[PDB]
Amino acid sequence: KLNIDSIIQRLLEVRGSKPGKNVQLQENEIRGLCLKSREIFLSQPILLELEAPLKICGDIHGQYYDLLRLFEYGGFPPESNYLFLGDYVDRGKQSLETICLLLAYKIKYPENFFLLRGNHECASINRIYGFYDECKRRYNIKLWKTFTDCFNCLPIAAIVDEKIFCCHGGLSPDLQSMEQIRRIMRPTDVPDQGLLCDLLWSDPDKDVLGWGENDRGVSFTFGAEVVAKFLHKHDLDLICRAHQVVEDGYEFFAKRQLVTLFSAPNYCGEFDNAGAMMSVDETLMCSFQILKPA
Ligand SMILES: [Mn+2]
Ligand SMILES: [Mn+2]
């Protein structure tokens, strides 16, 4: 029933245009993307095990023309494989086009295109920061609820070539074994405390040694020694996360043992930050493509 090729073509038809121009998909089509992608998310593991080559991207936040930019730098699927780390919606002006193209590509290339859950893929958050308002203005509240049901089934973390641990936010004090992530039940809303919360909300902090309070008013901050012990315990080389705006698009922490990625240049139209995209090759070498703000 769902014509994915037609949907992707219309979404990509606005390429090269001045940012702002919408793509008007039909309600039944956007609902179709949610229901079908949801099935795929539930069919695949909640802790993804992926293999290079792979392109990894951080926060997008409805900056649709910067998503299109990332693909023209990285290569449009299926030329390259992709892992996104969450926060697809809110703040930007085109959350709908952004999430729709991502879900379209997931349905089209389910073994070569991956999406993790960010803290904004939660009804309680995206009701406040723009996505609910965008859905209401352009379609209806029922469609927004259909996105919620989809988001509640997104995977939570990925391990790339048994060496890179990927999640939106960061580590948890309750994360002792990877089996604990695998035992998280979907669908679920993101709780105010616990493992799932921390994985989507925590931040690294240079001034903290162990675990400390997070200025967000939720989850914790973690220091470089916590990163060191986590990598050694689970025999990993790198934590790759997002969740925080960084000026150069990427930023290393704890002597290159953790990296923060952010893929929305000129975030909110307020910051003057670059976006970045991490490339991982077959030899497990990491490199970065940089998108300066325009
Ligand atoms: Mn974000
Ligand atoms: Mn976030």
Numbering used by the authors: 6 to 299
Task: Please quote the authors directly.
PP1 relies on a dinuclear metal center (rather than cysteine) for catalysis (Egloff et al, 1995; Goldberg et al, 1995) and is considered to be regulated largely through binding to specific targeting and inhibitor proteins, with little known about its physiologic redox regulation (Heijman et al, 2013). The PP1 catalytic domain displays a compact ellipsoidal structure with its dinuclear metal center situated at the base of a shallow groove on the molecular surface (Egloff et al, 1995; Goldberg et al, 1995). Recombinant PP1 is typically expressed in the presence of manganese salts, thus leading to a mostly Mn‐Mn center, but a previous report suggested a mixed Mn‐Fe center (Egloff et al, 1995). Our metal analysis on PP1 crystals detected both Mn and Fe ions (Mn:Fe ratio ~1:0.175), with anomalous difference electron density maps revealing the presence of Mn at both coordination sites.
However, a one‐electron reductant, ascorbate, efficiently reversed PP1 inactivation. H2O2 treatment causes an overall shrinkage of the PP1 coordination sphere by 0.12 Å compared to ascorbate‐treated crystals consistent with the oxidation of the dinuclear center. A transition from Mn(II) to Mn(III) or from Fe(II) to Fe(III) upon H2O2‐dependent metal oxidation would shrink the ionic radius of the metal by up to 0.14 Å (Cotton et al, 1999), thereby shortening the bond distances between the metal and coordinating residues and increasing the energy barrier for phosphate hydrolysis. In our crystallographic studies, two cysteine residues, C127 and C273, were often observed oxidized to a sulfenic derivative in electron density maps. Cys oxidation appears independently of H2O2 treatment as we have observed sulfenic acid derivatization also in ascorbate‐treated crystals. C127 and C273 are peripheral to the metal center and unlikely to affect enzyme activity, and we found that a PP1 C127/273S double variant exhibited the same catalytic activity as wild‐type PP1 and responded identically to H2O2 treatment.
